[PDB]
Amino acid sequence: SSQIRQNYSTEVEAAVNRLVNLYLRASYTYLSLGFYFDRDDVALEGVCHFFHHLAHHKHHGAHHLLKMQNQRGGRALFQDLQKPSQDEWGTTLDAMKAAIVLEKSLNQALLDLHALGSAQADPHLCDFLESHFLDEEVKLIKKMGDHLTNIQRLVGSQAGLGEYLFERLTLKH
Amino acid sequence: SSQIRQNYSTEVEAAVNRLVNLYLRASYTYLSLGFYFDRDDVALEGVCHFFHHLAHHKHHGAHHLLKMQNQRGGRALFQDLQKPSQDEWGTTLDAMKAAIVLEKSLNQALLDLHALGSAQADPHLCDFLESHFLDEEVKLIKKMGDHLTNIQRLVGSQAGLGEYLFERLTLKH
Amino acid sequence: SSQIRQNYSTEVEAAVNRLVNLYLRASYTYLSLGFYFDRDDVALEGVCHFFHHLAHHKHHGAHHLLKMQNQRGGRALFQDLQKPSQDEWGTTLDAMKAAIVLEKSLNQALLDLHALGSAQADPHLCDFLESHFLDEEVKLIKKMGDHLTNIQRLVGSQAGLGEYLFERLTLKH
Amino acid sequence: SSQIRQNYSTEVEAAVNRLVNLYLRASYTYLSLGFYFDRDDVALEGVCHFFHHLAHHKHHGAHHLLKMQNQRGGRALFQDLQKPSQDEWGTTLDAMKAAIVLEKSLNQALLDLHALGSAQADPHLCDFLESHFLDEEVKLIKKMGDHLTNIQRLVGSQAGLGEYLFERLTLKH
Amino acid sequence: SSQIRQNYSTEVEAAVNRLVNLYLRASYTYLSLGFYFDRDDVALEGVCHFFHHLAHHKHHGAHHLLKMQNQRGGRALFQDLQKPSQDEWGTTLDAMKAAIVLEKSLNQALLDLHALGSAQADPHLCDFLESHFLDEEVKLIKKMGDHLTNIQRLVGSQAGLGEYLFERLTLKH
Amino acid sequence: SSQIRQNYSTEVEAAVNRLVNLYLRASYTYLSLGFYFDRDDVALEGVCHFFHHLAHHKHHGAHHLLKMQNQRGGRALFQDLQKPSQDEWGTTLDAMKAAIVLEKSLNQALLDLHALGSAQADPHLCDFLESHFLDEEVKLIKKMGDHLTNIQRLVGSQAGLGEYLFERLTLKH
Ligand SMILES: [Cl-]
Ligand SMILES: [Cl-]
Ligand SMILES: [Cl-]
Numbered sequence A, B, C, D, E, F: 001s002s003q004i005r006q007n008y009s010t011e012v013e014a015a016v017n018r019l020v021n022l023y024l025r026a027s028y029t030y031l032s033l034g035f036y037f038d039r040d041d042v043a044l045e046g047v048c049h050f051f052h053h054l055a056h057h058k059h060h061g062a063h064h065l066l067k068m069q070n071q072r073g074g075r076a077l078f079q080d081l082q083k084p085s086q087d088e089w090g091t092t093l094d095a096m097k098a099a100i101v102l103e104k105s106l107n108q109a110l111l112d113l114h115a116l117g118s119a120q121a122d123p124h125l126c127d128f129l130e131s132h133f134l135d136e137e138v139k140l141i142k143k144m145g146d147h148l149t150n151i152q153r154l155v156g157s158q159a160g161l162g163e164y165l166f167e168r169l170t171l172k173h
């Protein structure tokens, strides 16, 4: 029986715990993507840094959701975290395609939770997602789309050259 | 067929991937312990900070192991991460007892891997564990033992008072 | 046959060598007291620092006596140093009681040597003890008495709580 | 008859002198590789700087081994230094392949000496190699493997373009 | 029954307490050597400073061993400290010969304990001795050997002149 | 067929490669001389530093010759480097006599190459040797002659004393 809980539905509490799982799964996926690009037989430092920074960002997102759960008087509940969908991530292009799929799934989870908060008349939850997550997701997906276009442009008939140039001249090393 | 791999056994490579799993499980356990102490109905900030800093340290340990795996020409392989052993962690004393159990299990995993590296005549692996992990673990376990003794001293017949004073005067808020 | 010795009795020379033994025994006792309080199953950092600083002070006292022995043209002679009187030192209260007993024995040795110097009309020795040792001893014994009173006040019927609070709020960590 | 020698086998002393020869041969090989890339008809400044910095590093390694030989009470003995295996070093790719072969041979010599020190119960020698050489070698071989992968990616069907871009955008000029 | 002890044999615990005794005996020997050189009838300030700095170093070594004993969950046990082997230490040459004998005995005690730790599969103990003591001992013995050679060179048929010049031009005053 | 080579005879090109061999042999000789003086049973730090600085200078000379070979469009060709003429170098006097013999042989090689350049009407080569090498050699030989005179003065009938004083008061430690 919570001393602080007010206007915080069990449905939102549960959805917040599921979204924490999704963010931690996303962080784990980005950890795996980064270390694949660090392999001596892949060796694309800028791609490794791009994904490791996203791993840190998704962990921070989980921390914000868990802090908000406690601020509202909900109860953090952790589930098993599934391994990433692949052990090897192919080319930079394959990896950036897999990343935008992942981000679109996170974005839909955020929109779904926002819609539940709207239906539950939970404006604190709706504001929380707007201020911490919805514009970060739109900006990240726009950046990944920009990268996909530049990677695609660079394939031509010299894939290796393009993959090197993208990593050297667009990403940070 | 690795261009860099030299003196790096498949047995060590696999053991390193298992130890990464153990460190990431430990990080997840500390995430759960920290957010339990952040609950409005628990509210021990110094205990929350103690465990969240350990969560970050264990994540960094996993990152070091994964960097070393790639430096040696091994292949990072990620498995499902099991949820922490509890959803609620009891008193500071219960939590610090669970933490020293966890740390003793990590320490034994480090000693086991060191012994495998010794048997495989892999001095780079042995040095790596000595320089990054074995003394950090001894120092952390000594610190937890010191804390257990101070928590135990403070229980007396006023458990609440002792739990507050330990958090206020030994831990950092 | 000393080129510098003047007004320096064989009795004082010998007493100075015995007092060096007493100071080095005191330093050793404080080394043992400090490491007992550093044990994981004792874990009172401020008590450990209190005694280790006294170990350093008593070593410096021995160094001053040995420097003065050579300045007067006496001959330093070292004897076996006996181990401390205990291997385990009980509570902070037991330890501070043992420390004030030790300090009272040092103080009496200083007064005895001062009286011998007075009888031998050795004003340099008398001045030396007044300026380096007699007021330091009075001040240290007064400080230990103050601590004993505060420790005693804190025992009540919650010994553990009192022992923690004294270490946290009077001693330095 | 050495005044300082203790626990330092004739076998280790001799192996240390042979390893000094290997390091000085490696320094000489890197001197030759660097000046080949400085030729007006090769003209890859970043490749010249990469190899000349390794020449300096291998000379410093020899100096450390010779200092340690004297610290242990062994006797430095110098042998003829063989010229490098080639007069002309082909492409950047040929040169980086020859460098990783050379480094793998140095690394095996270090592991062999570490194993001899282990068998001779010479922990100072084992520590010395761990602290000065084994991780530097692993890190250098990982860096060369990363470079090989990037050079290979860049060959495509425009070898010249790739060789220029690698030197301009990965190496330092 | 220790809350922290893990992989720490009773054999190592006892050997660590004996090595503490050896270090404190060494500190006491250096205290006596330093004050002999401070005598008005010896008066070699640089030799006095050389030995007093070693006395401080050996005391610090004992403190490190005692800290590590508690970090591992062993129990510090102190024994009587025997007086130094001599009351008067002869020439600088006699004293530096006695010092290198002492250091070789400490070094053998360190190697013996390292070998016991190796046999007990105690890599934390082995690392601890490597990182804190084995190279300091090799470096100190090399320095003493260098000094012995310079002192020996200076004896000629004017021992006094040589002893003065060594103290003035090699040691620090 | 060189794009840059102009007025650069095959005779000079070959002589430059031989002089590189002589400089690298000289560097190796100075490496051996320096480590002999670092021995615990020789222990003359200033003599060790004197020779190690010359080893570095002779390596730099080789680097200048090799840079100039490429600037002129000649081709660096490396030969086996012979070990130094001795394993042990006797007294400071023996060593400084061997050094001035070595320097006189380098100086004659420089004069011989200058004479060949003069005969070949190669003023760039002649200027190069004048500006980088001929005055450095004259100055170094003058310094060694000055040292020989001071060492010789100091032998008297107390060789050891003189050898110590020269190292302490003329050379740098
Ligand atoms: Cl799965
Ligand atoms: Cl589970
Ligand atoms: Cl006793």
Ligand SMILES: [Cl-]
Residues within 6 Å of the ligand: D082, D083, F080
């Ligand atoms: Cl050859």
Ligand SMILES: [Cl-]
Residues within 6 Å of the ligand: C080, E082, E083
């Ligand atoms: Cl005795």
Ligand SMILES: [Cl-]
Residues within 6 Å of the ligand: D080, F082, F083
């Ligand atoms: Cl030869």
